[PDB]
Design a protein around this motif. Structure first.
Motif, PDB file in Angstrom:
ATOM      1  N   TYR A   1       0.800  -1.223   0.000  1.00  0.00           N
ATOM      2  CA  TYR A   1       0.000   0.000   0.000  1.00  0.00           C
ATOM      3  C   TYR A   1       0.845   1.292   0.000  1.00  0.00           C
ATOM      4  CZ  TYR A   1      -2.243   3.746   2.795  1.00  0.00           C
ATOM      5  OH  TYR A   1      -2.640   4.951   3.281  1.00  0.00           O
ATOM      6  N   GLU A   2       1.845   1.417   0.875  1.00  0.00           N
ATOM      7  CA  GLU A   2       2.648   2.647   1.041  1.00  0.00           C
ATOM      8  C   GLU A   2       4.059   2.674   0.407  1.00  0.00           C
ATOM      9  OE1 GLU A   2       5.375   2.939   3.317  1.00  0.00           O
ATOM     10  OE2 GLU A   2       5.162   1.115   4.505  1.00  0.00           O
ATOM     11  N   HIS A   3       4.759   1.545   0.246  1.00  0.00           N
ATOM     12  CA  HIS A   3       6.128   1.575  -0.315  1.00  0.00           C
ATOM     13  C   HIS A   3       6.229   1.805  -1.836  1.00  0.00           C
ATOM     14  CE1 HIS A   3       9.321   0.927   2.608  1.00  0.00           C
ATOM     15  NE2 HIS A   3       8.427   0.226   3.323  1.00  0.00           N
ATOM     16  N   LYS A   4       5.191   1.479  -2.620  1.00  0.00           N
ATOM     17  CA  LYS A   4       5.133   1.631  -4.098  1.00  0.00           C
ATOM     18  C   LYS A   4       6.318   1.042  -4.917  1.00  0.00           C
ATOM     19  CE  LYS A   4       1.181   4.178  -3.406  1.00  0.00           C
ATOM     20  NZ  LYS A   4       0.530   4.704  -2.182  1.00  0.00           N
ATOM     21  N   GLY A   5       7.019   0.035  -4.389  1.00  0.00           N
ATOM     22  CA  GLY A   5       8.104  -0.682  -5.087  1.00  0.00           C
ATOM     23  C   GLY A   5       7.547  -1.802  -5.982  1.00  0.00           C
ATOM     24  N   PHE A   6       8.394  -2.541  -6.702  1.00  0.00           N
ATOM     25  CA  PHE A   6       7.944  -3.665  -7.538  1.00  0.00           C
ATOM     26  C   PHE A   6       7.644  -4.905  -6.681  1.00  0.00           C
ATOM     27  CE2 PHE A   6      10.158  -2.181 -11.818  1.00  0.00           C
ATOM     28  CZ  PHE A   6       9.246  -1.123 -11.946  1.00  0.00           C
ATOM     29  N   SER A   7       6.557  -5.623  -6.978  1.00  0.00           N
ATOM     30  CA  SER A   7       6.099  -6.805  -6.226  1.00  0.00           C
ATOM     31  C   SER A   7       6.085  -8.089  -7.044  1.00  0.00           C
ATOM     32  CB  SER A   7       4.701  -6.578  -5.642  1.00  0.00           C
ATOM     33  OG  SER A   7       4.691  -5.474  -4.757  1.00  0.00           O
ATOM     34  N   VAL A   8       6.361  -9.227  -6.414  1.00  0.00           N
ATOM     35  CA  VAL A   8       6.344 -10.547  -7.039  1.00  0.00           C
ATOM     36  C   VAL A   8       5.668 -11.560  -6.119  1.00  0.00           C
ATOM     37  CG1 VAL A   8       7.692 -12.359  -8.196  1.00  0.00           C
ATOM     38  CG2 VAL A   8       8.422 -10.016  -8.403  1.00  0.00           C
ATOM     39  N   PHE A   9       4.803 -12.406  -6.666  1.00  0.00           N
ATOM     40  CA  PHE A   9       4.147 -13.475  -5.916  1.00  0.00           C
ATOM     41  C   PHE A   9       4.327 -14.768  -6.716  1.00  0.00           C
ATOM     42  CE2 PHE A   9       0.780 -15.175  -3.015  1.00  0.00           C
ATOM     43  CZ  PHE A   9       0.249 -16.183  -3.840  1.00  0.00           C
ATOM     44  N   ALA A  10       4.794 -15.833  -6.073  1.00  0.00           N
ATOM     45  CA  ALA A  10       5.081 -17.094  -6.756  1.00  0.00           C
ATOM     46  C   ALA A  10       3.944 -18.112  -6.695  1.00  0.00           C
ATOM     47  CB  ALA A  10       6.411 -17.675  -6.269  1.00  0.00           C
ATOM     48  N   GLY A  11       3.240 -18.252  -5.576  1.00  0.00           N
ATOM     49  CA  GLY A  11       2.100 -19.176  -5.507  1.00  0.00           C
ATOM     50  C   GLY A  11       2.380 -20.655  -5.848  1.00  0.00           C
ATOM     51  N   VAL A  12       3.561 -21.162  -5.458  1.00  0.00           N
ATOM     52  CA  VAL A  12       4.099 -22.535  -5.651  1.00  0.00           C
ATOM     53  C   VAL A  12       3.097 -23.658  -5.316  1.00  0.00           C
ATOM     54  CG1 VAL A  12       6.067 -24.054  -4.939  1.00  0.00           C
ATOM     55  CG2 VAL A  12       6.467 -21.652  -5.214  1.00  0.00           C
ATOM     56  N   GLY A  13       2.274 -23.449  -4.287  1.00  0.00           N
ATOM     57  CA  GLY A  13       1.177 -24.330  -3.863  1.00  0.00           C
ATOM     58  C   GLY A  13      -0.109 -23.526  -3.636  1.00  0.00           C
ATOM     59  N   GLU A  14      -0.220 -22.344  -4.251  1.00  0.00           N
ATOM     60  CA  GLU A  14      -1.361 -21.436  -4.126  1.00  0.00           C
ATOM     61  C   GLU A  14      -2.614 -21.995  -4.785  1.00  0.00           C
ATOM     62  OE1 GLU A  14      -2.256 -19.159  -2.334  1.00  0.00           O
ATOM     63  OE2 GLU A  14      -3.359 -17.528  -3.291  1.00  0.00           O
ATOM     64  N   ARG A  15      -3.759 -21.774  -4.135  1.00  0.00           N
ATOM     65  CA  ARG A  15      -5.044 -22.321  -4.637  1.00  0.00           C
ATOM     66  C   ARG A  15      -5.488 -21.525  -5.867  1.00  0.00           C
ATOM     67  NH1 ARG A  15      -8.202 -25.168  -0.910  1.00  0.00           N
ATOM     68  NH2 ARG A  15      -7.054 -25.800   0.965  1.00  0.00           N
ATOM     69  N   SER A  16      -5.980 -22.216  -6.899  1.00  0.00           N
ATOM     70  CA  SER A  16      -6.472 -21.532  -8.125  1.00  0.00           C
ATOM     71  C   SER A  16      -7.633 -20.595  -7.771  1.00  0.00           C
ATOM     72  CB  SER A  16      -6.855 -22.536  -9.178  1.00  0.00           C
ATOM     73  OG  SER A  16      -7.650 -23.571  -8.621  1.00  0.00           O
ATOM     74  N   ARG A  17      -8.484 -20.993  -6.821  1.00  0.00           N
ATOM     75  CA  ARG A  17      -9.619 -20.134  -6.385  1.00  0.00           C
ATOM     76  C   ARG A  17      -9.083 -18.867  -5.707  1.00  0.00           C
ATOM     77  NH1 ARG A  17     -11.750 -19.897  -1.181  1.00  0.00           N
ATOM     78  NH2 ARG A  17     -10.680 -21.863  -0.709  1.00  0.00           N
ATOM     79  N   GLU A  18      -8.134 -19.016  -4.779  1.00  0.00           N
ATOM     80  CA  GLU A  18      -7.524 -17.841  -4.100  1.00  0.00           C
ATOM     81  C   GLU A  18      -6.709 -17.038  -5.119  1.00  0.00           C
ATOM     82  OE1 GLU A  18      -8.414 -20.408  -2.553  1.00  0.00           O
ATOM     83  OE2 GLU A  18      -8.769 -19.983  -0.428  1.00  0.00           O
ATOM     84  N   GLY A  19      -5.975 -17.726  -5.998  1.00  0.00           N
ATOM     85  CA  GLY A  19      -5.180 -17.042  -7.018  1.00  0.00           C
ATOM     86  C   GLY A  19      -6.053 -16.172  -7.929  1.00  0.00           C
ATOM     87  N   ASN A  20      -7.291 -16.601  -8.186  1.00  0.00           N
ATOM     88  CA  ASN A  20      -8.276 -15.879  -8.986  1.00  0.00           C
ATOM     89  C   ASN A  20      -8.817 -14.679  -8.199  1.00  0.00           C
ATOM     90  OD1 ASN A  20     -10.287 -15.610 -11.212  1.00  0.00           O
ATOM     91  ND2 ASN A  20     -11.717 -16.316  -9.731  1.00  0.00           N
TER      92      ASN A  20
END
Ligand SMILES: Nc1ncnc2c1ncn2[C@@H]1O[C@H](COP(=O)(O)OP(=O)(O)OP(=O)(O)O)[C@@H](O)[C@H]1O
Ligand SMILES: Nc1ncnc2c1ncn2[C@@H]1O[C@H](COP(=O)(O)OP(=O)(O)O)[C@@H](O)[C@H]1O
Ligand SMILES: Nc1ncnc2c1ncn2[C@@H]1O[C@H](COP(=O)(O)OP(=O)(O)O)[C@@H](O)[C@H]1O
Ligand SMILES: [Mg+2]
Ligand SMILES: [Mg+2]
Ligand SMILES: [Mg+2]
Lengths: 468, 473, 469
Positions: A175-194
């Protein structure tokens, strides 16, 4: 330079080549075959070289399903490891393990492609920054402060709250730092990922974010290499652009199990609880690259699944050596309705030193950990003898520990569907002031029920007024 | 011929044909320029363990025998620097101009080459120096669960060697590059780098380097011992060193045993830890003391590698996760920890006061099993409870705060003779600092006499001089 | 004849013999090689044959380091097991597992060499004349008497007093019994071998004792065969000289762990808690050869490490079967200042019967165990309720148990340097008379402090006066 498939055993495939034309380890191979008649099926598959066996033969791990393969199929050598696009063209895009786009948006057309396997920074490139990252989460901000440029690990069994806790951190820090972000989701749920992708696409945050997924339903080759695709994309912003970035990983345990599933088929001897002999080496190949250097910084939040609730298991056990902060989630707290369910006696951080935090912060955290340990040491005596047999000091210690364990609870914005409450953000000053006021006994004449699900101390006092 | 060729390549392991005249443990060179050790000799092949990046080696590559055992540079030139498991610099401060080289594998000094350990190795920690003493040629184990304070005891001990002729060797095995760098800045901040050598095999480094690391650090410590000087060697974690050996042995197909480890693993640590010794006067009187560290999973001291190393050492310090969260900060289990050399290691002044402390704590441990009720306990039992609570408090000490031996003697003396008994339990910690500032600021002769004679016998003044402090503060 | 090295994997070596004949199991082999060129290293190694494999090949366990070995090196068959010097020339000397002297005093020059693997005495050669071996140690001679020709085990954790109790027993036998002793340092810490050698060289006890050590840093094959070397040297004094001798073995736990490591190296399936499948067979090969016969007797004192306070571990559990007597040392007694720290309630022997020891000995030892147990059944009540609530009989029972508990304490000669107490030897007649006089309530108006560290009871009575009471 070409070769042929000799064996197929689930996720593992053996390939034989021409005299002296053998591919190197970690090198990518391609299978492109079109059905010659109605008894065959079309195939588009990528294989990764794992080891040399003799008789011009190499053993490999497949990145997708091996169904439809036939012995004698032609194989082509790409001459390098799995290579993925890097650069600003990758921001706001969703990707597969091979760096190909998941979204319907079209080709990425980036200027360069980087290999998935790279050496980590040397000892002279390391950093020693001691800066506190404020999360707004009342338990982490007190007992396990998060260091900028360090690794924070969330350990928990099945359904304790790891994903709900990661998503509240994503919301509050990005919210406040405004830098570049990355999320890998190696075992992330397709429903949550959506659910994540839709909120980021509507809030505009997606324009600064890279996503890689690699779902639970995928074969082990994909579950094994996907964490490295997201990390290779986050490294470009640190190394070539000099930026400060956030790297989120919902499950690094899946990366370890994918190596375990593969190991028996490769021909290796098993170790403790059936794991691969190379477990600590493989976890260090991933974790040593996730560091801040003199060029830029990578801060990372990671979730670790704990099988059968046993922390002594080789995968969770091997991981603790690499983390700067460690948060452990307890079923006993979750089953009692206290969320986020973080265990106050097993959670810790590198930053919890009198040289890095204020005297008032250090003293309040010390007094909280001690009163909870004293309460833990008495639940047997209170079970064998009546509570009217405990001394006045122990009687007060129980009432204060009872108020403190639930004042550590907080309603999250990302949990409004489960908690039935609006959601709250608490600053460090009000966390320290809050616990000090309970520890010092100013709030002894307030019911324990008033401290549950309130963000700050002033709220607890009006919650007591809402009940005569 | 002496030329071999590669027939299989895996995770840091390769196998080769030829090399008929290679010897067990010899270094071998690959055509890519990388190096490896010939560990298994078979009827038709040689099992080679690689000392670098293995991804450049392929089947059919040439491999040549070097005719040389693994050796590392040694001397005064390594002091105040950071090096890898092969002795190569990684601090970025340029080359090392060491004049001598020593093999990492050498025989330990014999029974007749030694002498009994009679002089102290001060740690500056009141729980260790009073109740778990260390002599200048002894092997002491630091053992407990993760995040309980294991490295803090080793680092505080290295920082206390400033005004003493001891070279300190810190060996980091399987540690993160970031924690190594964080420890090195702490050593420079306190000036410990004026006499400290740092050896480090990172978690990213191959298992062969994490295997060689303790032996290289030991070879550097031996140089000082062979020349009549004193040395201290710390192994940050022997548990990760055993895991690194398990990896190589399973990949080489040696048959497993207990907890999946190779049968050879006791000989691994005993061939290492028996090299720490105090030599006889004919050999030069030199010394090397060791402080290995082990991590236990969820408090299981009965596990294979822990029981194996507990049986090799001359004493063990036990750290509890329970004491650490309860506010007993160094977190040492004094009723379980032990040193055989105790008494012989200490000075005459420290031993005397250690004795009364030992009886008081032993009695308190007997009484605390049923200390749950105290308003019912006889007043006499309370005297035992109260004394024990106060002696526990004196043992509490902040990190990076070594107390000098004369002051540890002066405070344990006060607690054991009942002079801290009358002070309230919470006020004891405050009273300790105030009393030590009072004794040093006015009439410093007590602290001067204890440093010279090292035997007390002058207590009438210490008593009378103490009564002047307790009269109003 | 001559064979050749075929494989090398840590302490394990495989050898092929071809022509002539293959060596027998347990037979010793020798490797003697001089560097043919500057790229090689000189080697002097001994190997023990463990099993036949086929293809005129044998698997062996190395007695020293295998570093520097090369495939194709020549190997020689000695035609017999490891053979060690025997005789009076072995007295006052330090030895290696192979029987070579460690000390610089020179060659031993003995007249005969005996093999380490020989059959035990037969059922016919067994003797049944049970009697008591006086140690002069007031706790052992009363509660757990030692049978001549029998085995006594000392059980405990780290720092309880096992090696000091063994060193005092070695002294007392050389003082009044004037016998020959053997100490086997199975997996000995080199720091402790130096302290045993120095105590015996200065106290003069070394001239009547044999020291066998090897080292804790040697490979597992050496740590496993060393207890047999000390025993083969003790057998000559019984069989060829007809004497009664005492064999001390410090930590058979290291012996059990070394057979486990050898079995794991050879490829055998692990048994209960990872020990070797042959544990009970291997323990017995050593314990059976120690017996009284019609020629003479070998008695033995053995120390056993109890890992993590668990007596159910295979190593302590397999040992209990061959013990005539048992001593358990409690860490709680050691830290309270009571030495030798033997637990009066867990120590027992088989010879504690009226048909083998006096009626007065049996009756006193019974009355001691009983009053101690009665006091143990009351220390909860003495702590929670006032001591003024205990009855007159129980009050006297507590005071007598309190005097008896410390009267079991004794100052040792080998430990005089630590505390400065001269050291005492107490005869059986005075141990029985001492406890009888306390139990019979004759000596009641004497303070408890007078019974701590005193030797005989007259010394306690004068001490009461020395303390002005
Ligand atoms: N005496 C002490 N007083 C206060 N805090 C201490 C003390 N000793 C150690 N700590 C704190 O305990 C934490 C862990 O210390 P340390 O890293 O040495 O433990 P460790 O057991 O070696 O951990 P690890 O297993 O991860 O290496 C650190 O935050 C340190 O500052
Ligand atoms: N902070 C929270 N507030 C309320 N409910 C929570 C919270 N954290 C966890 N839960 C509940 O428990 C479950 C947590 O799911 P999730 O985070 O995915 O578990 P995990 O990843 O650990 O397997 C959800 O069903 C949710 O209703
Ligand atoms: N009789 C005694 N009197 C005083 N101190 C003793 C006595 N016996 C043992 N100790 C002390 O305890 C230690 C015992 O060590 P050791 O003999 O190795 O015990 P153990 O083998 O049972 O582990 C000695 O080094 C000494 O410090
Ligand atoms: Mg989840
Ligand atoms: Mg550490
Ligand atoms: Mg012992």
């Amino acid at each position: 330079t070409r070769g042929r498939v000799i064996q197929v055993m689930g996720p593992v495939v053996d390939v034989k080549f021409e005299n002296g034309h053998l591919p190197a380890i970690y090198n990518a191979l391609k299978i492109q075959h079109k059905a010659r008649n109605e008894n065959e099926v079309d195939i588009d598959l990528t294989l990764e070289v794992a080891l040399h066996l003799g008789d011009d033969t190499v053993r490999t791990i497949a990145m997708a399903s091996t169904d439809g393969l036939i012995r004698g199929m032609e194989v082509i050598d790409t001459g390098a490891p799995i290579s993925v696009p890097v650069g600003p063209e990758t921001l706001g895009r969703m990707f597969d393990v091979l760096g190909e786009p998941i979204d319907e948006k079209g080709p990425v057309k980036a200027k360069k492609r980087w290999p998935i396997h790279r050496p980590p920074p040397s000892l002279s490139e390391q950093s020693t920054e001691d800066e506190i990252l404020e999360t707004g989460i009342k338990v982490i901000d007190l007992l396990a402060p998060i260091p900028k440029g360090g690794k924070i690990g969330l350990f928990g069994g099945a359904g304790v709250g790891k994903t709900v806790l990661i998503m509240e951190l994503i919301r509050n820090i990005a919210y406040e730092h405004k830098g570049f972000s990355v999320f890998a989701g190696v075992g992330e749920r397709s429903r949550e990922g959506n659910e994540l992708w839709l909120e980021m696409k509507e809030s505009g945050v997606l324009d600064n974010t890279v996503l890689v997924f690699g779902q639970m339903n995928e074969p082990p080759g994909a579950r094994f290499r996907v964490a490295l695709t997201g990390l290779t994309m986050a490294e470009y912003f640190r190394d070539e652009e000099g930026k400060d970035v956030l790297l989120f990983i919902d499950n690094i345990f899946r990366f370890a199990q994918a190596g375990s599933e593969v190991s028996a088929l490769l021909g290796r001897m098993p170790s403790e609880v059936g794991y691969q002999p190379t477990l600590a080496t493989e976890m260090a190949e991933l974790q040593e690259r996730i560091t801040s250097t003199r060029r830029g910084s990578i801060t990372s939040v990671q979730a670790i699944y704990v099988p059968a609730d046993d922390l002594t298991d080789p995968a969770p056990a091997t991981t603790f050596a690499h983390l700067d902060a460690t948060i452990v989630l307890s079923r006993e707290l979750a089953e009692k309705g206290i969320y986020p369910a973080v265990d106050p006696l097993q959670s810790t951080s590198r930053i919890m030193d009198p040289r890095i935090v204020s005297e008032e912060h250090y003293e309040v955290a010390r007094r909280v950990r001690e009163i909870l340990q004293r309460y833990k040491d008495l639940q047997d005596i209170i079970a064998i003898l009546g509570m009217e047999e405990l001394s006045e000091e122990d009687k007060l210690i129980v009432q204060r520990a009872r108020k403190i364990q639930r004042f550590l609870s907080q309603p999250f914005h990302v949990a409004e569907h489960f908690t039935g409450r609006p959601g709250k953000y608490v600053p460090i000053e009000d966390t320290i002031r809050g616990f000090k006021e309970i520890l010092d006994g100013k709030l002894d004449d307030v019911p324990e029920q008033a401290f549950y699900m309130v963000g700050t101390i002033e709220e607890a006092v009006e919650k007591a007024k809402k009940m005569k | 011929s002496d030329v071999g060729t590669v027939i299989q390549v895996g995770d840091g392991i390769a196998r080769a044909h030829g090399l008929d005249n290679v010897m067990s443990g010899e270094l071998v060179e690959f055509a890519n320029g990388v190096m490896g050790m010939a560990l298994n000799l078979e009827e038709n092949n040689v099992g080679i363990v690689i000392l670098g990046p293995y991804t450049g080696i392929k089947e059919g590559d040439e491999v040549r025998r070097t005719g040389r055992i693994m050796e590392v540079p040694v001397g005064e030139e390594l002091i105040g620097r950071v090096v890898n498991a092969l002795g190569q610099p990684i601090d970025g401060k340029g080359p090392i101009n060491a004049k001598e080289f020593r093999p990492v594998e050498r025989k330990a000094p014999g029974v007749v080459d030694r002498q009994p350990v009679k002089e102290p190795l001060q740690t500056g920690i009141k729980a260790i120096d009073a109740m778990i003493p260390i002599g200048r040629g002894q092997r002491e184990l630091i053992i407990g669960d993760r995040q309980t304070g294991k490295t803090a005891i080793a680092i505080d001990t290295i920082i206390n060697q400033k005004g003493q002729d001891v070279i300190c060797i810190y060996v980091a095995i399987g540690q993160k590059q970031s924690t190594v760098a964080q420890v090195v800045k702490t050593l420079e901040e306190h000036g410990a780098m004026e006499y400290t050598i740092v050896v480090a095999a990172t978690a990213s480094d191959p298992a062969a380097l994490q295997y060689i690391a303790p032996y290289a650090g030991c070879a550097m410590g031996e140089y000082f011992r062979d020349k009549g000087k004193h040395a201290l060697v710390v192994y940050d974690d022997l548990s990760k060193h055993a895991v690194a050996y398990r990896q190589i042995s399973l990949l080489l197909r040696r048959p497993p045993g207990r907890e999946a480890y190779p049968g050879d693993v006791f000989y691994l640590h005993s061939r290492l830890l028996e090299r720490a010794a105090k030599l006889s006067d004919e050999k030069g009187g030199g010394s090397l003391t060791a402080l290995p560290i082990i991590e236990t999973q969820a408090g299981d001291v009965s596990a294979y590698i822990p029981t194996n190393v507990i049986s090799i050492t001359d004493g063990q310090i036990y750290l509890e996760s329970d004491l650490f969260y309860s506010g007993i900060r160094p977190a040492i289990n004094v009723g379980l920890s032990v040193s055989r050399v105790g008494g012989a290691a200490q000075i005459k002044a420290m031993k005397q006061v250690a004795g009364k402390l030992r009886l008081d704590l032993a009695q308190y441990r007997e009484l605390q099993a049923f200390a749950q009720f105290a308003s019912d306990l006889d007043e006499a039992t309370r005297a035992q409870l109260e004394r024990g609570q106060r002696m526990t408090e004196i043992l509490k000490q902040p990190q990076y705060s070594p107390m000098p031996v004369e002051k540890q003697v002066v405070i344990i003396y006060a607690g054991t003779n009942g002079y801290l008994d009358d002070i309230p339990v919470e006020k004891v910690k405050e009273f300790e600092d105030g009393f030590l500032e009072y004794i040093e600021s006015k009439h410093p002769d007590i602290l001067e006499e204890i440093r010279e004679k090292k035997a007390l016998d002058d207590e009438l003044e210490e008593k009378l001089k103490k009564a002047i402090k307790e009269f109003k503060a």
